[PDB]
Swiss-Prot record, chains A, B:
Coiled coil: none
Gene of this entry: TNKS2
Protein name: Poly [ADP-ribose] polymerase tankyrase-2
Every PARP catalytic domain range: 85-284
Protein source organism: Homo sapiens (Human)
Subunit structure: Oligomerizes and associates with TNKS. Interacts with the cytoplasmic domain of LNPEP/Otase in SLC2A4/GLUT4-vesicles. Binds to the N-terminus of Grb14 and TRF1 with its ankyrin repeat region. Interacts with HIF1AN. Interacts with RNF146; this interaction leads to ubiquitination and proteasomal degradation. Interacts with NUMA1.
Subcellular location: Cytoplasm; Golgi apparatus membrane; Nucleus; Chromosome, Telomere
Domain SAM: 1-62
Region of the whole protein represented: 875 to 1158 of 1166
Protein role: Poly-ADP-ribosyltransferase involved in various processes such as Wnt signaling pathway, telomere length and vesicle trafficking. Acts as an activator of the Wnt signaling pathway by mediating poly-ADP-ribosylation of AXIN1 and AXIN2, 2 key components of the beta-catenin destruction complex: poly-ADP-ribosylated target proteins are recognized by RNF146, which mediates their ubiquitination and subsequent degradation. Also mediates poly-ADP-ribosylation of BLZF1 and CASC3, followed by recruitment of RNF146 and subsequent ubiquitination.
Length: 284, 284
């Protein structure tokens, strides 16, 4: 509460600090208060309100180059998880997407274990204001290209760094270098394809508690994400690109007889995806 | 014309009719004027403005059951077409989609004619506020039923009734009964496929002038539309349907060895597609 104390003292309004302390008025709150709000907490004199508002203007606008607003607006940020009710139809729709896209992989369940269905434990909507705004800015940029069409999709993504993703967003600096299309973020439309990467490439060593890639006890996590594809480059064979091809925004790997068994979608910029749903589950 | 006169006379404010006539104030305009605007046009007495505003309130709200607002606010509606600049990247993107999706059809160009590319003449953005609002209402409805995902695509549609579509909107009451998937509205991701339907089923008799399906002179018009698919039902064989299958919002036809040569998308409600671009072109 020191910053607001110095701000008020520099104005010669120290005698209002009792009011400010009682109402828990910190500088971050004060910079968002006009005449009405200040009157509401008992600053009855117009002169004091005028001095306070002018001082706030001088700090925020007059010193914009220092970006004092950003350092004052760190509170309230971060990610929050909102549970979906199992009876709500959005929960059921996500569950139907999760269950109905299961496929039998070419390997005999080696990478992601053996199963046919899932036991869904909970479904959470991931809300992060800054990450969502970054996603929307990039989505609008992509839609201005490609004739006002974002080519948005909802796709799956498995990764042992889901916590980092939901708290910091997708980052191409952590791209999957070994991917078939090279140094991108990979998304699948079959949830069981992405389930093979919950414990890392090729299933890793499996679950940490039992070192089992087919463990039926441990709670797994997956992300069901909004992905902006824009104008997508189709490919049937492996390529080692570091970015999207010229004039395009993503790569769509198509299934082929001698190639992919299932579809793949690759983006080369972290801001073109947003992890909307976090799904906790076990395999059967 | 007279409506404003009767409205003002009933209020006993006949002496303001000179002002209302000089400023071309009609009732539909009057009902959108507050104290500020009325003072602007020179109604200086607070009492006269108060009486006019209360009269407007009694008409619009006190008689809401008769919907005078809809009768008054008919002016300003209707479709307009905005030309896209050929140098604009939006025009270039639409043209690129148009040209790149051309395909060779099983028939020897019998329906749509023989060509490898198009001579693009004009591209226009179709703006109609009422139809757009209806489309967005349906889109929100669908997204709420498909885990917050509308599943929006941009596809081609060719039809001899394009003017009716751009002025009145898509209507399932004019559905294509003869299609493989029933009485729906059909869209394609290949421009040539839709081009086969510009002059009717099987190309009809061709252009009105030369009665040639492969005419290289007459202008043609294609629609490139937003289509809300929601949860789409995937089919590989024909089956005549009246509406979308239970739990689904559209039907997506997939190519097959013994089935479809090219993709196909069918909606069963008219308000699930908005014609965004009107493409005027010639086959070459
Ligand atoms: O969902 C997916 N995740 C990954 C994946 C994620 C993280 C990592 C890493 F641990 F960071 F190196 C590696 C691979 N790869 C794929 C898919 C689904 S489409 C097929 C490829
Ligand atoms: O773009 C398309 N239009 C039509 C079409 C439009 C109007 C009419 C009618 F004359 F009004 F009855 C008939 C057919 N059919 C299809 C496509 C592209 S997907 C394949 C089918
Ligand atoms: Zn385990
Ligand atoms: Zn002709």
């Amino acid at each position: 509460d020191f910053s607001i104390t110095q701000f008020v003292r520099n104005l010669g309004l120290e005698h209002l600090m009792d009011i400010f302390e009682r109402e828990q008025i910190t500088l971050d709150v004060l910079v968002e208060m006009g005449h009405k709000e200040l009157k509401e907490i008992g600053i009855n004199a117009y002169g004091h309100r005028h001095k306070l508002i002018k001082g706030v203007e001088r700090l925020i606008s007059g010193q914009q180059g220092l970006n004092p607003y950003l350092t004052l607006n760190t509170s309230g940020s971060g990610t929050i998880l909102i549970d979906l009710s199992p009876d709500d139809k959005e929960f059921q729709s996500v569950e139907e997407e999760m269950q109905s896209t299961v496929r039998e992989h070419r390997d005999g369940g080696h990478a992601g274990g053996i199963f046919n269905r899932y036991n869904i434990l909970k479904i959470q909507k991931v809300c992060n204001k800054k990450l969502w705004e970054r996603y929307t800015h990039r989505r609008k940029e992509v839609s201005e290209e490609n004739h006002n069409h974002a080519n948005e999709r909802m796709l799956f993504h498995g990764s042992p760094f889901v916590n980092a993703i939901i708290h910091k967003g997708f980052d191409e600096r952590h791209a999957y270098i070994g991917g078939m299309f090279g140094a991108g973020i990979y998304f699948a439309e079959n949830s069981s394809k992405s389930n093979q990467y919950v414990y890392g490439i090729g299933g890793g060593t499996g679950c940490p508690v039992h070192k089992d890639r087919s463990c039926y006890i441990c709670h797994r996590q997956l992300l069901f994400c909004r992905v902006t594809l824009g104008k997508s480059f189709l490919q049937f064979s492996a390529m080692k690109m570091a970015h999207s091809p010229p004039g395009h925004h993503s790569v769509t790997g198509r299934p082929s007889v001698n190639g992919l068994a299932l579809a793949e979608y690759v983006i080369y910029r972290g801001e073109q995806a947003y992890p909307e749903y976090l799904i906790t589950y076990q395999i059967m």
